[PDB]
Amino acid sequence: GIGTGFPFDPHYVEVLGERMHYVDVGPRDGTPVLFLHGNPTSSYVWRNIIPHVAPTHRCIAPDLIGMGKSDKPDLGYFFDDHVRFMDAFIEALGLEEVVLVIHAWGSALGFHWAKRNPERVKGIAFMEFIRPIPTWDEWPEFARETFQAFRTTDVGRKLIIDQNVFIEGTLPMGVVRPLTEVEMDHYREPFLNPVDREPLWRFPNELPIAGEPANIVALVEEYMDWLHQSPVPKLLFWGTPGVLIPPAEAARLAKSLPNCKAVDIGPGLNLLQEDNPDLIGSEIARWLSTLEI
Numbered sequence: 364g365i366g367t368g369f370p371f372d373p374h375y376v377e378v379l380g381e382r383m384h385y386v387d388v389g390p391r392d393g394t395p396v397l398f399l400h401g402n403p404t405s406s407y408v409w410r411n412i413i414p415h416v417a418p419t420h421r422c423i424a425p426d427l428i429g430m431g432k433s434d435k436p437d438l439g440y441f442f443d444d445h446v447r448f449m450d451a452f453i454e455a456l457g458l459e460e461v462v463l464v465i466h467a468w469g470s471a472l473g474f475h476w477a478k479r480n481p482e483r484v485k486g487i488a489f490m491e492f493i494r495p496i497p498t499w500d501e502w503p504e505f506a507r508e509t510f511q512a513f514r515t516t517d518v519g520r521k522l523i524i525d526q527n528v529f530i531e532g533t534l535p536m537g538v539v540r541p542l543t544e545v546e547m548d549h550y551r552e553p554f555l556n557p558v559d560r561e562p563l564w565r566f567p568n569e570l571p572i573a574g575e576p577a578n579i580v581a582l583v584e585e586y587m588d589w590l591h592q593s594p595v596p597k598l599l600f601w602g603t604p605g606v607l608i609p610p611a612e613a614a615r616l617a618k619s620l621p622n623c624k625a626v627d628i629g630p631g632l633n634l635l636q637e638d639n640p641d642l643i644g645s646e647i648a649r650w651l652s653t654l655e656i
């Protein structure tokens with residue numbers, strides 16, 4: 364059965380006046396592997412993937428500011444806030460060159476950091492990642508009216524902040540296999556208090572859909588422009604039917620993006636880590652062995 368525990372010792376670092384929590388396992392020398400989660404998850408989403416990589420490589424998995432075991436400042440939790448705190452996190456750990464393993468909103472953070480710091484990125488493994496969604500027709504039909512309602516300050520905040528729907532409903536609807544009560548309690552833990560749910564609502568309001576917000580659309584277009592030409596080694600995981608990346612898109616990207624290998628994980632929606640963690644971790648471990656790190 365897929366593991367439900369989170370055995371990792373807590374590590375904390377002060378970042379811009381705030382304490383950020385991170386997993387830090389594996390050997391201390393060599394190039395580290397930095398794991399970035401998205402909405403509404405935490406380093407918990409990497410718990411069954413990291414044990415495949417940690418025998419041979421350092422694994423660092425931070426909880427984004429306002430999420431997981433990290434501190435909860437009184438912020439808007441805009442994408443720009445996450446960019447500021449992640450930039451500062453990476454410098455606080457003194458990381459030099461890295462391999463990135465990134466997912467969904469963590470993929471926007473990772474690709475935006477890689478585009479700005481390409482000399483420091485030796486490879487990117489990614490899955491269910493953020494690209495511009497040009498019209499609402501390109502958002503999955505089964506989740507279209509709900510994400511449209513999320514992108515409002517009235518209904519959207521009622522659902523996500525008052526009623527915790529991103530945790531109770533959107534999260535399980537992002538996994539094909541059923542989540543256990545223990546797993547759901549791990550995802551619920553950072554957000555038991557409704558006043559702490561601001562990141563859960565601002566994230567879907569930042570998604571680059573139908574041209575808004577224009578500033579995020581532009582930023583995401585920029586790192587996609589880079590990714591289509593950069594020689595950086597790329598490993599793309601995808602599932603069927605997917606959410607942000609449908610199978611036909613994954614197959615086109617595997618051909619268009621330079622130096623990109625694609626791996627079919629089988630059934631999957633958004634949190635591919637919850638549907639086939641052993642294939643994702645074992646393929647990352649094999650792919651790392653082919654990099655000059």
Ligand SMILES: CN(C)c1ccc2c(-c3cc(C(=O)NCCOCCOCCCCCO)ccc3C(=O)O)c3ccc(=[N+](C)C)cc-3oc2c1
Nearest residue numbers: 401402467468506509526528531532533535536537606633
């Ligand atoms: C308390 N209260 C008002 C509600 C309301 C609605 C529900 C809903 C629910 C959910 C939705 C809903 O979230 N759709 C969007 C799905 O997007 C999936 C793809 O993105 C993944 C993340 C991508 C991130 C990218 O960055 C719609 C409609 C409903 C409904 O029932 O009306 C629940 C659904 C499932 C459930 N259990 C335990 C399995 C329990 C549910 O419980 C509910 C409770």
Ligand SMILES: [Cl-]
Nearest residue numbers: 402566567570
């Ligand atoms: Cl989101």
